[PDB]
């Protein structure tokens, strides 16, 4: 952006993209995962269905939270971020920081753990790998930054 827009952005810490570095901001992503396992198990189905449901819902929720909405949910200066998602605002646009690394690693380990159960079905295995790769890591790369289709 131009000089005035950058000054407005830099004049105040972004309250909508700063909590991710605070205390407990890492263990929460692991804790929300253990609850999905105990809930989909409470549904009472076969292990593979529970695991695939867990993985799918986590990935979809993470995407709809960090990638779909643009801007700040309140007034910043004149908005100053009217066309940036929450993921792009992490660490004032600095890529491959420890936080970004952790949020990249999480889905891969999720798939590694879940694979052992639904591995014997081709359709579930293909769907899970497709959704993981295409709705996880891909928007989080450094090449898709500020890329609108």
């Amino acid at each position: 952006e131009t000089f005035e827009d950058e000054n407005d952005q830099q004049m105040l810490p972004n309250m909508a993209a700063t909590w991710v570095d605070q205390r407990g901001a890492w263990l929460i992503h692991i804790v929300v995962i253990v609850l999905l396992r105990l809930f989909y198990s409470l549904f009472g189905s076969t292990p593979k269905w529970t695991w695939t449901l867990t993985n799918m819902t986590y990935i979809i929720g993470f995407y709809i939270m960090f990638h779909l909405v643009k801007g700040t949910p309140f007034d910043f200066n004149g908005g100053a971020y009217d066309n940036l998602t929450m993921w792009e605002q992490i660490n004032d646009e600095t890529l491959y920081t420890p936080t970004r690394k952790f949020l990249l690693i999480v889905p891969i380990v999720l798939f590694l753990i879940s694979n052992q159960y639904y591995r014997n079905d081709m359709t579930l295995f293909l769907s899970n790998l497709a959704v993981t790769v295409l709705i996880g890591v891909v928007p989080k790369l450094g090449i898709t930054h500020r890329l609108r289709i």
């Binding site: 690693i105 891969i108 380990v109 590694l112 694979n115």
Partner: peptide, 14 residues
């Protein structure tokens, strides 16, 4: 094809 996928995932995670 399973262990191939897992090994590729380990490479990319590193």
């Amino acid at each position: 094809g399973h262990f191939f996928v897992e090994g590729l995932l380990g490479v990319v995670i590193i």
